[PDB]
Amino acid sequence: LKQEQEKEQSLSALQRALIALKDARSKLEKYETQSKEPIAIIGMSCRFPGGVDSPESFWQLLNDGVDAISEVPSNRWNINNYYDPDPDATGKISTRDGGFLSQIDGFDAPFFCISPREVQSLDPQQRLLLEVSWEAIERANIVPDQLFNSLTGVFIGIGSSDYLNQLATSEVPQAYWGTGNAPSAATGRLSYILGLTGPNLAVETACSSSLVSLHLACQSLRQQECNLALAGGVNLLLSPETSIIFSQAKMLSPDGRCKTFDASANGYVRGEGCGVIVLKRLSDAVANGDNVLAVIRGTAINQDGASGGLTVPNGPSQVAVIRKALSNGGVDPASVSYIEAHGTGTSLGDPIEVGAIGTVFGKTHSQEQPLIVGTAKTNIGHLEVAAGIAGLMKVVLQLQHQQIAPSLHFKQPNPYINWSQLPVQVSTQLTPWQTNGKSRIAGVSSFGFSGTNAHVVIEEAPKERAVYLLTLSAKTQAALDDLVNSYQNYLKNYPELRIADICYTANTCRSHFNNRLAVVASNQQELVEKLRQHQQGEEVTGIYSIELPNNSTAPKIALLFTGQGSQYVNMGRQLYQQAPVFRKALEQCNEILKSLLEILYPANLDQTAYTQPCLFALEYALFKLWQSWGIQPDVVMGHSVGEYVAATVAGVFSLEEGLKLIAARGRLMQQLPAGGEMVSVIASESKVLEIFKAMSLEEKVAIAAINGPESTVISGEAEAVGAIATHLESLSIKTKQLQVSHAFHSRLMEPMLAEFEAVAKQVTYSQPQISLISNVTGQQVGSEITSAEYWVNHVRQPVRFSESMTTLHQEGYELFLEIGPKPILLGMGRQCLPEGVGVWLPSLRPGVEAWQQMLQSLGQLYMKGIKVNWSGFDQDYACHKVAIPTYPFQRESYWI
């Protein structure tokens, strides 16, 4: 009674309390989960010594154990004016050698919109950050337009270079000197060019700079200050001054080599380079199906303090920083298999580092199961500000390839290191990175000269249509030519990648620039051939190219819907057997109506009863496909049977309403009597009208269509039609009798006109959304279309197609897409408009495979600037984002 109530209340009380407890718990779990969340590395790019211009090239170098160290290039400074190995020499450099980039003056100024004036005072550090970041983003398969105006963070390890001090020597200070040389402007320019609004900073902690930026980026992402982050470092060797300071401070090896862990370690070698990585919180990278290269688990940064010299390393400081980083990501020391050491190859540094590693991993590691150590420094030198980014990248590649690369110069193990009491092993050979199921974890160390130490822990990453359309584009013809070349080498080197996947990635994950190319292909070999054909200039079907003018807009597009005489057996069968947007429309029709499908596509006809509603559906199905790919008509029109589908598209009817009407007239005109003929006459509408008058046949013969200025279709009684044709032939006027059933748009259509006006009366008429050109008028349809009168008058009146075309031409239309099984209206269309005017595109065409016609037309719309829904175009297929070529920068020399 009321006992039910006190018990109902008690259940509802608990119910609420459990709901509140669940939600409170969830709220706190989210906070904890977020705080220790791995940060997915989703893209990387670099410029390192030894001609390294990508992670693939860095890995080959690392894999093959190549010494990238060379003599100071004559073009940087004359090493002959500074080299002196004598430790007592004043104002001299200890070494002849360094780790240098292949070029530093080269930059694609127009790509980034930097005027040639501005580039003269632009720090080569900024030039490299722009190229590298762009590529890091491309490689992460993000589109900079969809990245534009976003909450993305920029965290760069960057110090001032000597560029400005080389300008101050020759010229008078200019306004660009500031933006061109400030490290704050360097990072600022990335946010400016890529349109990034998140946190932005330039850090400088010497050798740990690159790793401090990572820590800060990971802080930002966990704290939800951004959703994407660029993290990197730069370091350039522009003047010998810094090399004199480092030689005088006794930091540099007279051998010009980092002989890390070797008995002969006697300082480091100065290298230069640039590395940028793209970061997301792991959950966001899993949600977006990004390829995770590796994950950053934990980071720590600390200081040596008063414990020892300002420029001398400190073992307890290094121990605290590794331990804090392991603590920050919840990694146990036992989980770690590899360390990419700071390993600068100094006499006192090597023992302090290995000793600090021995302190951290001593209880977790054994001499039989040791920790592996090594450094990129033995290949490319010490990149100082950019060391750490190079270290991280090496570790990431090692994780990708499941191999540990060899560390160079390790001949005599250092006697000052107690090898027998430290479970440490120097990687001397390229070896499989073995594990026992256990996920591969590594550490990267960077110990700054002024005592600012940093450490990072990185774990291994977790765990139909047979005709294709490829789009390529660059900001310049030269750049597109270089891009096409990239693809030819790319396709020859990676034949294991699916053309479906390559195409999908290029269309969806790459920028659509003004110098474009569209290629239709069914297999990799065909694609390869067509790219070669285009390069040689061999004008071949399925390959379209154009340079759109700068700041150009998508043109207006006219949709022309086909008429009665267009049908054939199995028309667009392939799209039914292969295209879901088309099928969800063609089957939806079939439900309204033997079956539409058995008539259209039999197991194994031209009669108006079938003929009329079929085309409507087929055209609605084709229109459903085109809008799915992002095509939206600016005006519509159709030859009688096609004005039905043109009207449903603009709103006038529902698929059901419109398809009921077309099935009605089809069934109606079929039961109508014989003796009905239609003739195609090559003569003006006036010439035919004067002959109708002359022969007194005006009440027995009608003009069915005006399709051209000298191309008209006559309709009426068999004898009368034959009489006018015979007379027209007598006048040398060409005539063609149509394989028609009944005399359409002729007086003979009067009996049915009431039984069909009955059907039209039982229909709701909604106003049109898109512009429609009337068949009855040859002008823009007004409010006239609303009343079922317009549709009854439609059967009786001649089809003014010629005027419909001139209307479109007067409105400035030059792009026409035919939605139908044959390019009929295109042929008639080309005849109405002046020669060579407009672009005419079919949907279906006999002799051309359905997908082949649809894609050749799509590529041609993409040449006009029509924004294609490329996501939409590959939605119903099993596509995966793959690695594809990055942008081919058109480099030019800027200095002085």
Residue 826 tokens, joined: 């295109």
**Residue 24 engages its own copies in binding (rule: CB under 8 A):** yes
Grouping H, G, I as helix, E, B as strand and the rest as coil, residue 638 is: strand
**Which residue stretch of 157-165, 416-424, 727-735, 813-821 sits at the interface with its own copies (rule: CB under 8 A)?**
157-165
**Residue 31 engages its own copies in binding (rule: CB under 8 A):** yes
The residues in 302-341 that bind its own copies, with binding defined as CB under 8 A, are 302-307, 310-311, 317, 320
- Looking at residue 276, its amino acid is V
Annotated binding residues for Ca(2+), written as ranges, equal 304, 309, 312
**Which residue stretch of 21-29, 65-73, 350-358, 783-791 sits at the interface with its own copies (rule: CB under 8 A)?**
21-29
> Alpha carbon of 2 to those of 214, 473, 808: distances in Å?
65, 77, 78
Closest approach, Cβ 85 to its own copies, in A, equals 17
Q: Which is nearer to its own copies, 15 or 632 (CB)?
A: 15
Q: Which is nearer to Ca ion, 304 or 350 (CB)?
A: 304
Q: Among residues 46, 218, 226, 342, which one is catalytic?
A: 342
Centre a 10 Å sphere on the Cβ of residue 81 and count the other Cβ atoms it contains: 9
Q: Which is nearer to Ca ion, 38 or 388 (CB)?
A: 388
Closest approach, Cβ 458 to its own copies, in A, equals 20
**Residue 75 engages its own copies in binding (rule: CB under 8 A):** no
Question: 279 φ, ψ to 5°?
Answer: -120, 145
Q: Which is nearer to Ca ion, 308 or 362 (CB)?
A: 308
**Which residue stretch of 113-121, 303-311, 490-498, 566-574 sits at the interface with Ca ion (rule: CB under 5 A)?**
303-311
Q: Where are the alpha helices (DSSP H) in 701-849?
A: 718-730, 755-761, 788-796, 801-810, 824-832
Select from 106, 308, 316, 872 the one that contacts Ca ion (CB under 5 A).
Answer: 308
Active site residue 794: no
Q: Which is nearer to its own copies, 178 or 462 (CB)?
A: 178
Closest approach, Cβ 184 to Ca ion, in A, equals 12
**Which residue stretch of 152-160, 389-397, 638-646, 816-824 sits at the interface with its own copies (rule: CB under 8 A)?**
152-160
**Residue 43 engages its own copies in binding (rule: CB under 8 A):** no
Question: Is beta strand 468-474 parallel, antiparallel or unpaired with respect to 403-404?
Answer: unpaired
**Residue 304 engages Ca ion in binding (rule: CB under 5 A):** yes
**Residue 113 engages its own copies in binding (rule: CB under 8 A):** no
**Residue 204 engages its own copies in binding (rule: CB under 8 A):** yes
Select from 157, 374, 451, 572 the one that contacts Ca ion (CB under 5 A).
Answer: 451
Closest approach, Cβ 24 to its own copies, in A, equals 4
Grouping H, G, I as helix, E, B as strand and the rest as coil, residue 128 is: helix
**Which residue stretch of 173-181, 373-381, 779-787, 806-814 sits at the interface with its own copies (rule: CB under 8 A)?**
173-181
The residues in 247-306 that bind its own copies, with binding defined as CB under 8 A, are 248-250, 300-306
Cα–Cα distance for residue pair 359/314, rounded to 1 Å: 13
Closest approach, Cβ 394 to its own copies, in A, equals 23
Select from 126, 141, 179, 344 the one that contacts its own copies (CB under 8 A).
Answer: 179
**Residue 231 engages its own copies in binding (rule: CB under 8 A):** no
- Crossing angle of helices 580-592/608-628, nearest 10°? 150
The residues in 561-620 that bind its own copies, with binding defined as CB under 8 A, are none
Residue 438 tokens, joined: 């256990």
**Residue 896 engages its own copies in binding (rule: CB under 8 A):** no
> How many whole angstroms from its chain centre is CA 730?
64
Q: Which is nearer to Ca ion, 16 or 250 (CB)?
A: 250
Q: Which is nearer to its own copies, 164 or 497 (CB)?
A: 164
> Alpha carbon of 495 to those of 102, 307, 361, 488, 527: distances in Å?
30, 57, 44, 11, 12
**Residue 509 engages its own copies in binding (rule: CB under 8 A):** no
Which of its own copies, Ca ion, none interacts with 209 (beta carbon under 5 to 8 A by kind)? its own copies
Which of its own copies, Ca ion, none interacts with 165 (beta carbon under 5 to 8 A by kind)? its own copies
773, 635 contact by CB (below 8 A): yes
Select from 40, 52, 119, 203 the one that contacts its own copies (CB under 8 A).
Answer: 203
> How many whole angstroms from its chain centre is CA 98?
38
Cα–Cα distance for residue pair 665/672, rounded to 1 Å: 11
Q: Which is nearer to Ca ion, 194 or 720 (CB)?
A: 194
Which of Ca ion, its own copies, none interacts with 523 (beta carbon under 5 to 8 A by kind)? none
Closest approach, Cβ 204 to its own copies, in A, equals 5
Active site residue 207: yes
Residue 724: closest CA among 697, 755, 744, 751: 697
Q: Which is nearer to Ca ion, 315 or 542 (CB)?
A: 315
Where does residue 83 rank: exposed (0-12), middle (13-18), buried (19+ CB within 10 A)? buried
Q: Which is nearer to its own copies, 328 or 425 (CB)?
A: 328
Closest approach, Cβ 231 to its own copies, in A, equals 14
Question: 77 φ, ψ to 5°?
Answer: -175, 160
Closest approach, Cβ 454 to its own copies, in A, equals 9
**Residue 345 engages its own copies in binding (rule: CB under 8 A):** no
> Alpha carbon of 677 to those of 426, 566, 613, 772: distances in Å?
94, 18, 22, 30
Q: Total binding residues for its own copies by CB under 8 A? A: 84
Residue 143: closest CA among 867, 864, 890: 867
Cα–Cα distance for residue pair 765/652, rounded to 1 Å: 5
Q: Which is nearer to its own copies, 247 or 505 (CB)?
A: 247
> Alpha carbon of 836 to those of 373, 390, 548, 706, 895: distances in Å?
70, 57, 19, 22, 49
Q: Total binding residues for Ca ion by CB under 5 A? A: 4
End-to-end Cα separation, the chain, in angstroms: 96
Closest approach, Cβ 209 to its own copies, in A, equals 8
**Torsion angle defined by CA atoms of residues 131, 135, 137 and 138, in that order, rounded to the nearest 10 degrees:** 140
Closest approach, Cβ 390 to its own copies, in A, equals 18
Which of Ca ion, its own copies, none interacts with 178 (beta carbon under 5 to 8 A by kind)? its own copies
Which of its own copies, Ca ion, none interacts with 91 (beta carbon under 5 to 8 A by kind)? its own copies
Closest approach, Cβ 19 to its own copies, in A, equals 10
Which of Ca ion, its own copies, none interacts with 204 (beta carbon under 5 to 8 A by kind)? its own copies
Three-class HEC string of 457-486: EEECCCCCCCCEEEEEEECCHHHHHHHHHH
Give the helix/strand (H/E) hosting 150: none
**Which residue stretch of 363-371, 448-456, 570-578, 646-654 sits at the interface with Ca ion (rule: CB under 5 A)?**
448-456
Cα–Cα distance for residue pair 223/239, rounded to 1 Å: 40
Cβ neighbours of residue 351 closer than 8 Å, sequence gap 6 or more: 414, 416, 417
The residues in 310-369 that bind Ca ion, with binding defined as CB under 5 A, are 312
**Residue 37 engages its own copies in binding (rule: CB under 8 A):** no
Question: 716 φ, ψ to 5°?
Answer: 170, -160
Which residues are paired to 83 by β-bridges?
93
**Residue 878 engages its own copies in binding (rule: CB under 8 A):** no
105, 120 contact by CB (below 8 A): no
Q: Among residues 215, 365, 382, 745, which one is catalytic?
A: 382
**Residue 451 engages its own copies in binding (rule: CB under 8 A):** yes
**Residue 149 engages its own copies in binding (rule: CB under 8 A):** yes
Question: Is beta strand 431-432 parallel, antiparallel or unpaired with respect to 468-474?
Answer: unpaired
Residue 585: closest CA among 622, 626, 632: 622
Residue 278: closest CA among 461, 62, 387, 134: 134
Active site residue 382: yes
Annotated binding residues, written as ranges, equal 304, 309, 312
Write out the residues near Ca ion by the rule CB under 5 A: 304, 308, 312, 451
Query: Where in the sequence numbering do the catalytic residues fall?
Result: 207, 342, 382
